[PDB]
């Protein structure tokens, strides 16, 4: 297998299906990537694979806090550490610094650990280095988050700095032989909701050149309609022959709509996090399993789902496990939710390849929102 | 398979190995039974079986609190509810009332739920009924706990009431056709540390007649030496041709010593509970995986253990998962600990059958305590 090869097998409108080939494995696109912070929480990696995941996301910010990137490296890298031998994408660590920790400058950011109060630093160079130490397969350039809403001036300044940081990320990545030869690097488009800034960002990233392009700065409170409007003009600005990654997006209907607009890759904490909190995804919409109406419901979480949980376990049992605070409850909900997500991506891939994705999208929405 | 058949295949001194045959399966003795409260916490039942468990224990007190015995019955019984199709032993619910909840009389006990404050009742009749509703395979007679230390007078009064409750448990069990024909009933020996009371209790229970006999009222703070001394004279009082069950005992060295004194069955929360809390059992004694000395230890929890955890996972990874509070950490520790317990019981069974259990006991202790 090559270091990185993206091949498009079929198209329908803006939607694409294909494969990313990397040394550690093949990724079927459109792809959903479950999120990992040290483990997917409450699942063995074998179970994560069993649900159909081709790749997972590792949270750089959490991993650098504990157990630390250096220690992970000494222990043999992230793949060895979490027992997952297929591709891993790592974020830059930058978003969580903004959202979770407690000085920003052109050089980077210093922050205090939200756990120990210890001091840590991130910059384009240090982010890439940490991602190297983890040994990830797809590395994200380090960028500066733009809050929503943002004035044109603030959005432009943040986008411009992010583009300068994209070049530095690129150079840092290329300067490390082992990393440049074995991993891939994705650039991140910024520019908030402004078309002209999104275009300048797309232009800057294409000029630098990356293996894939993420649309960043969305799913930050703008609502689905505005997100879709921004995707409408933003995705066509990105090179057509490279993967398009929508970061932090994962409601099932968000995903279907984003694919309709040319997105190839997704990650979200939603199926895992909301799994532990009692929300299960079904083809008829999400349900909260804790609700009293399920106390004696012997049906599985979803009647069509092919996952191992739905083959054996009833809503009633999971209802009582979750309400009892039993770990198993969370284990079963999480397995089902991520498996549901993978089945969704499979139906998307099949429908595009068969030229009926538009019809699938309509059928999915009618039933999901009914 | 018969309702209940205990066959002794081999003996060495007071130690025995054999099988209990029941409708739902075969139990290899000496047996260790992992404890379940609604789920084994943090394990799928398939995993529990995979470790070698032939039977598990269900906590009647917790189950009657949530989801409730009646609801479990409506949902198809405990086997269906927790997805375990092999034998299940249920306790009477009586010990936890004393230890966990908040009026005692000759009729039984009333108590307030330690969760909701709701009022509940237990008596020999109601205990047996609840155990019927759960559909368990081995039912424990409802008894009255004797605290340690206890005066001869208090111990005698409690033992005598327990014996009257044993008769009532027996009659209640026999009065239910489906239960009497498909399940087994164990009596419980009381009498604290007093030989004469232990003898009167053994006599009373034998006169009533049960399928198995538990030695109750131990592991209540008396220390291993005193426990072994009480077992020395107590176990020979029980009918030799029926299983001998030591309740709530499960340190590995406790188990080996109890088997030397004629005990066939054990249950304890120790491997599961202490698993979640960072303690792993090894042939060289227990270790606390959270200790800094394991932060970069790439060896498995135990070098000889055949469990799936030890085939893949290092102490270093489990160290960081547990310290991060990750659910997976608890999952892996628990799987290993219960698998270790099953391997211990297997080595005990093999050594007895081969007439070398005395030598095994000595070798085990030397290494475990080294
Ligand atoms: Zn499912
Ligand atoms: Zn093990």
């Amino acid at each position: 297998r090559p270091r990185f090869s993206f091949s498009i097998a079929a198209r329908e409108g803006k939607a694409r299906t294909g494969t990313i080939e990397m040394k550690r494995g093949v990724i079927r696109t459109p792809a959903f990537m479950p999120v990992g912070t040290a483990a997917v929480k409450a699942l063995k990696p074998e179970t994560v694979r069993a649900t159909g995941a081709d790749i997972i996301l590792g949270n750089t910010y959490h991993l650098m806090l504990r157990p630390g990137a250096e220690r992970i490296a000494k222990l043999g890298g992230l793949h060895s550490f979490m027992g997952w031998d297929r591709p891993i994408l790592t974020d830059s660590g930058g978003y969580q610094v903004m959202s979770l920790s407690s000085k920003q400058s052109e050089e980077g950011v210093t922050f205090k650990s939200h756990l120990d109060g210890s001091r840590h630093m991130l910059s384009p160079e240090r982010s890439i280095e940490i991602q190297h130490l983890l040994g990830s397969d797809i590395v994200m350039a380090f960028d500066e988050c733009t809050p929503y809403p943002a004035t044109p001036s603030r959005a432009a300044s943040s986008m411009e700095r992010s583009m300068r940081w994209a070049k530095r990320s690129r150079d840092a990545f290329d300067s490390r032989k082992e990393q440049a030869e074995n991993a891939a690097l994705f650039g991140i488009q910024q520019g908030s909701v402004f078309e002209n800034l999104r275009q300048q960002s797309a232009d800057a990233l294409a000029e630098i050149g990356f293996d894939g392009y993420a649309v960043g700065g969305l799913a930050v409170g703008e609502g689905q309609d505005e997100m879709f409007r921004v995707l409408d003009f933003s995705v066509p600005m990105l090179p057509d022959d490279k993967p398009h990654y929508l970061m932090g997006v994962g409601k099932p209907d968000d995903i279907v709509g984003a694919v309709e607009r040319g997105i190839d890759m997704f990650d979200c904490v939603l199926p895992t996090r909301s799994g532990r909190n009692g929300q299960a995804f079904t083809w008829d919409g999400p349900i909260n399993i804790r609700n009293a109406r399920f106390s004696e419901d012997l049906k599985p979480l979803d009647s069509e789902c092919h996952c191992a949980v739905c083959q054996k376990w009833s809503r009633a049992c999971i209802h009582h496990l979750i309400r009892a605070g039993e770990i198993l409850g969370a284990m079963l909900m999480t397995e089902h939710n991520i498996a549901f997500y993978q089945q969704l991506m499979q139906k998307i891939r099949d429908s595009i390849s068969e030229g009926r994705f538009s019809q699938f999208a309509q059928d999915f929405r009618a039933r999901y929102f009914a």
Side-chain angles (χ1 to χ4, degrees), chain A residues 31 69 82 85 105 195 212 231 258 291 298-299:
Chain A
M82 50 186 41
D85 65 23
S105 75
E195 184 166 7
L231 290 176
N291 192 287
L298 288 177
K299 299 185 301 302

Side-chain angles (χ1 to χ4, degrees), chain A residues 88-97 99-102:
Chain A
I88 295 177
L89 184 151
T90 47
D91 52 30
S92 76
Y95 179 86
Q96 292 74 33
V97 169
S99 62
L100 291 177
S101 71
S102 297

Side-chain angles (χ1 to χ4, degrees), chain A residues 117-118 120-153 155-177 179-189:
Chain A
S118 55
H120 300 268
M121 176 275 303
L122 270 182
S123 63
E125 296 79 16
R126 176 62 178 163
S127 180
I128 298 301
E129 182 187 40
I130 291 170
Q131 296 181 76
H132 167 69
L133 289 173
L134 299 173
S136 58
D137 301 284
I138 301 173
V139 178
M140 301 303 297
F142 186 73
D143 64 343
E144 184 180 70
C145 313
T146 314
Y148 179 83
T151 64
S153 177
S157 296
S158 181
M159 178 277 288
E160 285 153 8
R161 162 172 289 172
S162 288
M163 297 304 97
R164 296 188 296 264
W165 285 4
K167 174 58 173 164
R168 284 168 59 187
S169 296
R170 169 47 83 184
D171 295 339
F173 180 96
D174 291 342
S175 81
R176 210 168 265 106
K177 178 184 175 68
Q179 194 173 31
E181 287 176 10
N182 295 294
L185 181 66
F186 282 23
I188 304 175
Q189 184 202 42

Side-chain angles (χ1 to χ4, degrees), chain A residues 173-177 179-272 274-324:
Chain A
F173 180 96
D174 291 342
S175 81
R176 210 168 265 106
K177 178 184 175 68
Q179 194 173 31
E181 287 176 10
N182 295 294
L185 181 66
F186 282 23
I188 304 175
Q189 184 202 42
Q190 294 293 342
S192 186
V193 303
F194 308 105
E195 184 166 7
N196 66 325
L197 298 181
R198 288 273 170 190
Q199 185 65 74
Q200 294 167 12
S201 181
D203 292 340
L205 295 174
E207 185 172 340
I208 297 164
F210 293 90
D211 295 309
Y213 299 85
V215 177
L218 297 178
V220 285
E222 75 284 2
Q224 188 189 83
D225 293 342
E226 188 73 355
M227 181 176 69
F228 284 173
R229 180 184 74 86
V230 173
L231 290 176
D232 287 342
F233 61 72
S234 294
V235 184
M237 299 166 177
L238 307 174
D240 178 83
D241 61 346
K242 298 299 180 56
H244 307 149
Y245 171 22
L246 185 54
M247 311 181 77
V249 164
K251 273 190 297 165
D253 54 296
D254 289 330
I255 288 171
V256 172
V259 169
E260 290 177 302
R261 295 158 173 84
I263 295 300
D264 307 306
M265 292 171 66
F266 300 89
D267 86 275
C268 205
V269 302
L270 192 60
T272 49
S274 74
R276 300 192 299 282
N277 294 292
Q279 178 175 71
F281 297 90
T282 83
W283 296 110
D284 300 293
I287 59 180
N288 196 309
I289 204 63
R290 301 188 57 124
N291 192 287
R293 73 171 63 92
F294 300 115
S295 65
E296 296 176 353
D297 190 341
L298 288 177
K299 299 185 301 302
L301 291 172
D302 179 282
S303 53
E304 296 181 21
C305 180
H306 301 99
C307 93
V309 183
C310 290
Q311 300 328 291
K312 176 169 185 172
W313 302 89
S314 67
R315 289 163 171 192
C317 299
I318 302 173
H319 167 95
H320 294 100
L321 291 175
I322 286 293
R323 285 174 69 123

